[PDB]
């Protein structure tokens, strides 16, 4: 069971997203259902080592946003053009 | 590090004198002295010698490893002693000792007379053998190299001054 | 490379043969060619003896389950085991002739009755004849 820790984004946009990546973190989104989409930030190293396993893209993952637990499935991934890094992840509510 | 952490056991009859960084090791075979690198902290105590780094020195452990190794072969030196054996290969190549001078006939116009330094002694059991004996591992090693230098083993017949434990690889001449 | 699964399997195979056999012979075999060994393996299978070279750490594990728990101090240096499953004896005599004829090794210690046999007193299991001798 993959458990991802996340914080809610206090900011949005180009400026703010680039600042996260410089801080070894990356933006991501949680959408789907009647619920409003949740803009979140993830630790780069942690999620990077997780996504290395094929099960990440198939299995239901749990995202821990300020105590609360959210069952999701990896919908889409924006990868760095040439480096082994992640730019953004789309998470769909399962 | 794995070397520095391993203690040197000073046997009975061996006197160790430490004056800061200067170490004098006196035994039955002789007396050797060495100045250790400032990064080394040498401790005596019991029938052993222990080495370690000194605070503020970057390469401390590497230095302490060398310091150990040298002091271990200093102890071996003043007790057991060291022996290097050389053997002359080739027609007319001969050697003889006359006190502290090794007379070498090695295919040159003039015979070679090599003066031995303080502490190294030599004897010729054969006309084609040199046996060096001393307490300083570096100096015996140096003299053995200098004697070898007059005629280094050639690769077509193995001719020349070679160490006893030396593997002299030979080859065939260009075909046609 | 030996995995723990492989190590547990080797402890199992030598633990099973430990119970069943009657007389076990522990000896050195360093500095002996495969030609003389394949010759003691043919002379072993014939006499109903099980021949093996096992890691001394792996031996102190298969032997902990009784009765050879006195062969511990013999698991220092190269160790070769001779488990006689068919008729007690066989190996303790087969090894004594192989030791004298080849001059290499010394033969560590023997075991029978769940009791320790020293390197000097191996003449006890060497003079014992057949089963098959009482008639």
């Amino acid at each position: 069971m993959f458990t991802i820790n996340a914080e809610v984004r206090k900011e949005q946009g180009k400026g703010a997203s680039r600042r996260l990546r410089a801080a070894n973190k990356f933006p991501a989104i949680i959408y789907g259902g009647k619920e409003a989409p949740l803009a979140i930030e993830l630790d780069h190293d942690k999620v990077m080592n997780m996504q290395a396993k094929a099960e990440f893209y198939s299995e239901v993952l749990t995202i821990v946003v300020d105590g609360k637990e959210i069952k999701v499935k990896a919908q889409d991934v924006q990868r760095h053009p040439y480096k082994p890094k992640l730019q953004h992840i789309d998470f769909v509510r399962a | 590090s794995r070397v520095a952490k391993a203690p040197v056991v000073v046997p009975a009859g061996v006197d160790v004198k430490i004056n800061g960084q200067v170490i004098t090791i006196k035994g039955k075979n002789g007396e050797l002295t060495r100045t250790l690198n400032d990064a080394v902290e040498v401790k005596h105590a019991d029938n052993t010698l222990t080495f370690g780094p000194r605070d503020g020195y970057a390469d401390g452990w590497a230095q302490a490893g060398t310091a150990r190794a040298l002091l271990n072969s200093m102890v071996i030196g003043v007790t057991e002693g060291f022996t290097k054996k050389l053997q002359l290969v080739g027609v007319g190549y001969r050697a003889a000792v006359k006190g502290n001078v090794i007379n070498l006939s090695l295919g040159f116009s003039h015979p070679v007379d090599h003066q031995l330094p303080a502490g190294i002694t030599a004897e010729c059991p054969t006309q084609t053998e040199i046996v060096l004996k001393g307490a300083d591992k570096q100096v015996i090693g140096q003299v053995a190299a200098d004697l070898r230098a007059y005629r280094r083993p050639e690769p077509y017949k193995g001719k020349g001054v070679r160490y006893a434990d030396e593997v002299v690889r030979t080859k065939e001449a260009k075909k046609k | 490379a030996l995995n723990l699964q492989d190590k547990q399997a080797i402890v199992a195979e030598v633990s099973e043969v430990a119970k069943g056999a009657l007389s076990a012979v522990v000896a050195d075999s360093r500095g002996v060619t495969v030609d003389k060994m394949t010759e003691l393996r043919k002379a072993g299978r014939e006499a109903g003896v099980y021949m093996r070279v096992v890691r001394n750490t792996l031996l102190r594990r298969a032997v902990e389950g009784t009765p050879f728990e006195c062969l511990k101090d013999a698991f220092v240096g190269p160790t070769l085991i001779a488990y006689v499953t068919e008729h007690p004896g066989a190996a303790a005599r087969l090894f004594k002739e192989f030791a004298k004829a080849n001059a290499k090794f010394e033969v560590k210690a023997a075991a029978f009755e769940g009791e320790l046999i020293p390197a000097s007193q191996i003449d006890r299991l060497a003079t014992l004849p057949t089963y098959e001798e009482a008639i």
């Binding site: 094929a54 893209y57 198939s58 990896a74 889409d76 991934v77 990868r79 053009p81 040439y82 | - | -």
Partner: protein, 136 residues
């Protein structure tokens, strides 16, 4: 040697080679040779690299060339002054932005594909990286 079979026009403006690549994923094979640099690959460089990797895999497996040299490059000869019309077309290049997957391979073990790509990379004017196929 790759080249367009026909073109709407003979010659083309120099232009620029700004931006990041399109086609940054192994989409046909199991392994790829991704560009980390920015530059032009000539039809001769592309062929040189293709030959190297083909010889390497002993003509086993399958190779894909994700780049096409569709850009005509003109050149003025020696002893020719400036002006008097645009030069003549001499060779064809493919503009390369960081991220472009240049070559793809499958039907060979990873170790071999890695070596074949090491050999081809030496024939190229731009820095490359080895890439593996991914699940999304």
């Amino acid at each position: 040697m790759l080249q367009p079979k026909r073109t709407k026009f003979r010659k083309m403006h120099k232009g620029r080679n700004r931006g990041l690549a399109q086609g940054t994923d192994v989409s046909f094979g199991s392994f790829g040779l991704k560009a980390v640099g920015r530059g032009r690959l000539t039809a001769r460089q592309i062929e040189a690299a293709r030959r190297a990797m083909t010889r390497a895999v002993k003509r086993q497996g399958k190779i894909w060339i994700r780049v096409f040299p569709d850009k005509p490059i003109t050149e003025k000869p020696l002893a020719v002054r400036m002006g008097k019309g645009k030069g003549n077309v001499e060779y064809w290049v493919a503009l390369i932005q960081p991220g472009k997957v240049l070559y793809e391979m499958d039907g060979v073990p990873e170790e071999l594909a890695r070596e074949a790509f090491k050999l081809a990379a030496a024939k190229l004017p731009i820095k490359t990286t080895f890439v593996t196929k991914t699940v999304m």
